């Protein structure tokens, strides 16, 4: 499974496939994709 | 007296949302009413059934307005009345 | 072939003539235009040739 976030309560979900799309603990159907864990690099230029 | 001026601004009326939606919603509601009447003729002349949900069709009005504001064509008899907002800058 | 009221014939003909007509030219003056199911007027061969951005 893959980790997501709720729209409002910002709770961590990590719902799996074939769970459709909804938050547990509230009805918001807007799920954020929960930013990547691995490191990202920039040049200050 | 001089020839009347066509461009005198006091003689031009502007139409915002209200008058528009008035026009359009008028002709929608006429179409609705007329449809209910047709359903009554069909069921009474054919003596079948009357049930309010079948008699009233919501998407007539609903999808009608939704459509119009999507296309912005009032009819064409009018076009481009609706335009997606410019968020370029708060001034704009 | 059969069952000809001859009022139906004369109409069915006028139908054919109409289709072929708007096939070659959709915009003939005074006649009804052929409207594609979307409500847009059909683009006839003549429309394809006629204006700027036509083939020519």
């Amino acid at each position: 499974t893959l980790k997501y976030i709720c729209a409002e309560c910002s709770s961590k979900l990590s719902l799996s496939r074939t769970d459709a799309v909804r938050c547990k603990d509230c009805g918001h159907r807007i799920l954020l994709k929960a930013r990547t864990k691995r490191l990202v690099q920039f040049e200050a230029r | 007296k001089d020839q009347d001026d066509r461009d005198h601004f006091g003689k031009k009326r502007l139409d915002l949302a209200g008058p528009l939606l008035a026009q359009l919603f008028k002709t929608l509601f006429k179409k609705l009413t007329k449809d209910i009447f047709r359903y009554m003729q069909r069921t009474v002349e054919e003596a079948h059934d009357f049930n309010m949900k079948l008699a009233i069709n919501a998407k007539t009005i609903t999808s009608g307005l939704k459509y119009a504001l999507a296309t912005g064509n009032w009819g064409s008899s009018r076009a481009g009345v609706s335009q997606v907002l410019n968020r370029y800058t708060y001034s704009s | 072939h059969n069952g000809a009221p001859h009022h139906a014939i004369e109409e069915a003909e006028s139908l054919l003539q109409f289709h072929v007509a708007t096939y070659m030219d959709n915009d003939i003056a005074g006649q009804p235009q052929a409207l594609q199911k979307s409500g847009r007027p059909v683009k006839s061969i003549r429309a394809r040739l006629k204006g700027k951005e036509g083939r020519i």
Partner: protein, 87 residues
């Protein structure tokens, strides 16, 4: 003015769509053959025009049976005020 319904909005929609609630109001809810035939004939002299309904009401027999024998004695007129009645 116009009044804005303030409810939880769920109840109003439930009534709108299929509600599992119906009706609750009503608007546009919409003698043997020997004596039978003899009696029917006396009606025919008594009435120059009559119906399979009037005959079935009298004879308490299906209109189909009434229509068969009547074809023999009576004839049908389908045009005029008396239309659909045997003379």
């Amino acid at each position: 003015r116009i009044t804005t319904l303030d409810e939880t909005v769920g109840v109003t929609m439930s009534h709108t769509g299929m509600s599992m609630r119906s009706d609750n109001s009503n608007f546009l809810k919409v003698m043997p053959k020997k004596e039978i035939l003899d009696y029917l004939f006396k009606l025919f002299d008594e009435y120059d025009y009559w119906s399979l309904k009037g005959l079935k009401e009298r004879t308490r027999q299906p209109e189909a049976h009434l229509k068969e024998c009547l074809d023999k004695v009576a004839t049908l007129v389908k045009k005029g005020p008396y239309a659909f009645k045997y003379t």
